[PDB]
């Protein structure tokens, strides 16, 4: 188990996805045309996880770029690292999906899905040992939401034993393109509860607040939100992309993070938050990454309890001080970690720091406080659905009101299930 297949779907999926390849290619010393110009052998030791090797010693990302319109995928190709991607892996339709889950999942996206799966099969075939898939998308649009979850369902049919993880951007009125986002997200969440092993719940509410409150940016663009996303995505993928004596693949990580199959929605976090000169001390990283302000999903961890925690520190620091600090927050806030999973906070350290920072920490939290996120989308859903508002857009594409009722019920069951373990 070494190779991971990456897929990016829709405007948002391709935007944050393109930043992921901008960040990690710099970390692996791969230039905009695909040639290696690093210095450490550690940059090439596990380069196979995300790159295929081409003729002339070129490194081509194992990345499939999906959208139902050309727009954003034309921007990706024109953008700074656009030339590195394999041209066959740009699979796109023309009419778009108009922020419509039904168009992505059932009509427009159905017409395109089989040609995307052919490229996935192409990449999966020439993989010595495929460990799984990762997907970037939003749940608020049409393509990433509707087609992304369709692809996830088709990939599970063809590759039932491989890991499926997602980086799933959640919608919020604060950063809102259309009023139907709660509908699109609720329909997607039900798909993710069934068909993913992990979903990283990037909340655009939280990314905005981090940009506004704790980074003093008055008018945040999507680039400012995506900067925080790409830093986190680098962090969660670090332990696969480098050593250091950590013998773990996606399954091993998923086995230790997910005690219950449906409860695999994580709370990502990063320290320090950037947009510096004084490098942070190990106590500061530990306090910041556990701080609510640094959470990428707009939930208060004090309102829930941690099932599992994973923290991966980057940079040259004392592992003794890391162990001391990670044991300090557990033993001084022991009510917020479930007693019925002993030793649930685990830690790794990687020597290579990311670009610009001398040391950093990435936080992955399977907290029951994530119910707050699903409750917030459930309220926005019901507000519209009690009056069947905007439903004509979905019923015109052949959907039934029953499918909405089901999805509503399934997400409120997920919230009930998170509540069960919060009190136990």
């Amino acid at each position: 188990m070494r190779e991971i297949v990456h897929i990016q779907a829709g405007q948002c999926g391709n935007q944050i996805g393109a930043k992921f390849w901008e960040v990690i290619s710099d970390e692996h010393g791969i230039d905009p045309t695909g040639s290696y110009h690093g210095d450490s052998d550690l940059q090439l030791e596990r380069i196979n996880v995300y790159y295929n090797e081409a003729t002339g010693n070129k490194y081509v990302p194992r990345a499939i770029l999906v959208d139902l319109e050309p727009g954003t995928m034309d921007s990706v190709r024109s953008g700074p690292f656009g030339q590195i991607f394999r041209p066959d892996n740009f699979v796109f339709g023309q009419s778009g999906a108009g922020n419509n889950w039904a168009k992505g999942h059932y009509t427009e996206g159905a017409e395109l899905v089989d040609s995307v799966l052919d490229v996935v099969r192409k990449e999966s075939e020439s993989c010595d040992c495929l460990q799984g898939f990762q997907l970037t998308h939003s749940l608020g649009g049409g393509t990433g939401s509707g087609m992304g979850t369709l692809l996830i369902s088709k990939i599970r049919e063809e590759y039932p034993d491989r890991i499926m993880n997602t980086f799933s951007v959640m919608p919020s009125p604060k950063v809102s393109d259309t009023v139907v986002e709660p509908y699109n997200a609720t329909l997607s969440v039900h798909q993710l509860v069934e068909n993913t092993d992990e979903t990283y719940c990037i909340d655009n509410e939280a990314l905005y607040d981090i940009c506004f409150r704790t980074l003093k940016l008055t008018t945040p663009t999507y680039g400012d939100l995506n900067h925080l996303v790409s830093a986190t995505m680098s962090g969660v993928t670090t332990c696969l992309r480098f050593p250091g004596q950590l013998n773990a693949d996606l399954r091993k990580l998923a086995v230790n993070m997910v005690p219950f199959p449906r409860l695999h929605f994580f709370m990502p976090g990063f320290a320090p938050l950037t947009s510096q000169y004084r490098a942070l001390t190990v106590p500061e990283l530990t306090q910041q990454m556990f701080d609510s302000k640094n959470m990428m999903a707009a939930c208060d961890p004090r309102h829930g309890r941690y099932l599992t925690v994973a923290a991966i520190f980057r940079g040259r620091m004392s592992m003794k001080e890391v162990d001391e600090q990670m044991l300090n927050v557990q033993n001084k806030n022991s009510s917020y970690f479930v007693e019925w999973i002993p030793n649930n906070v685990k830690t790794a350290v990687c020597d290579i720091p990311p670009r610009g920072l001398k040391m950093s920490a990435t936080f992955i939290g399977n907290s029951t406080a994530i119910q707050e996120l699903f409750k917030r989308i459930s309220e926005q859903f019901t507000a519209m659905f009690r009056r069947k508002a905007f439903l004509h857009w979905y019923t015109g594409e052949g959907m039934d009101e029953m499918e909405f009722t089901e999805a509503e019920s399934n997400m409120n069951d997920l919230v009930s299930e998170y509540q069960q373990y919060q009190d136990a």
Binding site: T107, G396, E397, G398
Partner: protein
């Protein structure tokens, strides 16, 4: 179901339209048929007037 309903709408729009355009052509023709039949009734009255002049001499 999405095809079925899009076809249903094309179907029933086409039938509703053909039913109206035919019903209108029936009406407008029956309106003009009545107008000419009243005008032809005057020609028959003017033939009785011109006969009652000659049949009174």
């Amino acid at each position: 179901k999405a095809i079925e309903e899009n076809n249903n709408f094309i179907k029933m729009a086409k039938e509703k339209l053909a039913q109206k355009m035919e019903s209108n052509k029936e009406n407008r023709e029956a309106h003009l048929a009545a107008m000419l039949e009243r005008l032809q009734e005057k020609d028959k009255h003017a033939e009785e007037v011109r006969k009652n002049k000659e049949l009174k001499e």
